[PDB]
CSV table of C-alpha atoms in Angstrom, one decimal:
chain,number,residue,atom,x,y,z
A,1,UNK,CA,-60.0,-93.7,37.3
A,2,UNK,CA,-57.9,-96.1,35.3
A,3,UNK,CA,-59.9,-95.3,31.6
A,4,UNK,CA,-58.4,-92.2,32.5
A,5,UNK,CA,-54.8,-92.3,33.0
A,6,UNK,CA,-54.4,-94.8,30.4
A,7,UNK,CA,-56.6,-92.5,28.3
A,8,UNK,CA,-53.5,-90.1,29.1
A,9,UNK,CA,-57.0,-88.0,31.3
A,10,UNK,CA,-55.0,-87.2,34.6
A,11,UNK,CA,-51.2,-86.8,33.0
A,12,UNK,CA,-53.1,-83.3,30.8
A,13,UNK,CA,-54.9,-81.8,33.3
A,14,UNK,CA,-51.5,-82.2,35.6
A,15,UNK,CA,-49.5,-80.8,32.8
A,16,UNK,CA,-52.2,-77.5,31.8
A,17,UNK,CA,-52.8,-76.4,35.9
A,18,UNK,CA,-49.2,-77.5,37.1
A,19,UNK,CA,-46.5,-76.6,33.4
A,20,UNK,CA,-49.3,-74.8,31.3
A,21,UNK,CA,-50.2,-72.4,34.1
A,22,UNK,CA,-47.4,-71.6,35.7
A,23,UNK,CA,-45.3,-68.5,36.4
A,24,UNK,CA,-42.5,-69.4,35.5
A,25,UNK,CA,-40.7,-71.5,32.1
A,26,UNK,CA,-40.7,-75.0,31.1
A,27,UNK,CA,-37.2,-76.6,31.3
A,28,UNK,CA,-22.9,-77.0,30.7
A,29,UNK,CA,-19.6,-75.7,29.2
A,30,UNK,CA,-16.6,-75.5,32.0
A,31,UNK,CA,-15.1,-73.7,29.2
A,32,UNK,CA,-14.7,-70.1,30.4
A,33,UNK,CA,-16.6,-67.8,29.4
A,34,UNK,CA,-16.1,-63.8,27.5
A,35,UNK,CA,-17.8,-63.1,30.4
A,36,UNK,CA,-14.8,-64.0,32.6
A,37,UNK,CA,-12.2,-62.1,31.1
A,38,UNK,CA,-14.2,-58.8,30.2
A,39,UNK,CA,-12.3,-56.7,32.3
A,40,UNK,CA,-9.5,-57.7,30.2
A,41,UNK,CA,-11.3,-55.9,27.2
A,42,UNK,CA,-12.6,-53.1,28.8
B,1,UNK,CA,-24.0,-58.9,27.6
B,2,UNK,CA,-20.6,-58.8,26.5
B,3,UNK,CA,-20.9,-60.8,23.9
B,4,UNK,CA,-18.4,-60.7,20.0
B,5,UNK,CA,-20.1,-58.9,18.6
B,6,UNK,CA,-20.4,-56.1,21.3
B,7,UNK,CA,-16.0,-55.7,21.2
B,8,UNK,CA,-16.2,-55.2,17.5
B,9,UNK,CA,-18.7,-52.8,18.0
B,10,UNK,CA,-15.8,-51.5,20.6
B,11,UNK,CA,-13.0,-51.7,18.4
B,12,UNK,CA,-15.4,-50.5,15.6
B,13,UNK,CA,-15.8,-47.1,16.8
B,14,UNK,CA,-12.4,-47.1,18.2
B,15,UNK,CA,-10.9,-46.9,15.3
B,16,UNK,CA,-13.8,-44.8,13.6
B,17,UNK,CA,-12.0,-41.9,15.1
B,18,UNK,CA,-8.8,-42.6,12.4
B,19,UNK,CA,-11.3,-42.5,9.5
B,20,UNK,CA,-13.0,-39.3,10.6
B,21,UNK,CA,-9.4,-37.8,11.5
B,22,UNK,CA,-8.7,-39.0,7.4
B,23,UNK,CA,-11.3,-37.7,5.8
B,24,UNK,CA,-11.1,-34.3,8.3
B,25,UNK,CA,-7.3,-34.4,6.7
B,26,UNK,CA,-8.8,-35.1,3.5
B,27,UNK,CA,-11.0,-31.9,3.0
B,28,UNK,CA,-8.2,-29.4,5.0
B,29,UNK,CA,-6.1,-30.5,2.1
B,30,UNK,CA,-8.1,-29.5,-0.8
B,31,UNK,CA,-9.6,-26.2,1.0
B,32,UNK,CA,-5.3,-25.2,0.9
B,33,UNK,CA,-5.4,-26.6,-3.1
B,34,UNK,CA,-8.7,-24.7,-3.6
B,35,UNK,CA,-6.6,-21.8,-2.1
B,36,UNK,CA,-3.8,-22.7,-4.4
B,37,UNK,CA,-6.3,-22.9,-7.6
B,38,UNK,CA,-9.1,-20.5,-7.2
B,39,UNK,CA,-6.9,-18.0,-6.0
B,40,UNK,CA,-4.3,-16.6,-8.9
B,41,UNK,CA,-2.4,-19.6,-10.8
B,42,UNK,CA,0.7,-16.4,-12.3
B,43,UNK,CA,3.6,-18.7,-11.9
B,44,UNK,CA,5.7,-15.4,-13.2
B,45,UNK,CA,8.4,-15.8,-10.4
B,46,UNK,CA,10.4,-19.3,-11.7
B,47,UNK,CA,11.2,-19.6,-7.5
B,48,UNK,CA,7.0,-18.9,-6.9
B,49,UNK,CA,6.1,-21.4,-9.6
B,50,UNK,CA,8.2,-24.0,-7.8
B,51,UNK,CA,7.0,-22.9,-4.9
B,52,UNK,CA,3.7,-23.5,-6.0
B,53,UNK,CA,4.3,-26.8,-7.7
B,54,UNK,CA,6.2,-28.4,-4.9
B,55,UNK,CA,3.3,-28.2,-2.4
B,56,UNK,CA,1.1,-29.7,-5.2
B,57,UNK,CA,3.2,-31.8,-5.4
B,58,UNK,CA,4.0,-32.7,-2.4
B,59,UNK,CA,-0.2,-32.8,-0.4
B,60,UNK,CA,-1.0,-35.3,-3.2
B,61,UNK,CA,2.0,-37.5,-1.9
B,62,UNK,CA,0.3,-36.7,1.6
């Protein structure tokens, strides 16, 4: 177990069975965005 | 979603109607010019010659 942990095997298996097989993805500004004032432009 | 490019496209869409109007005016004026040209260009009447010349000048200025 310890040798595997140092070799990084367990972390790789973690990533594989948690993220490399996840249905979902892998992974800011308060300035007003154009979506807030779209009706004005329309 | 709404973005800068979409607004540009909307504005160009609104402004291209103006270009369509301008070209339609062009072709109408040139159809009138053809009606004047292909039709007999006799200028025996001074009044008729003056009227035709002023029409041509007006269309050119437009």
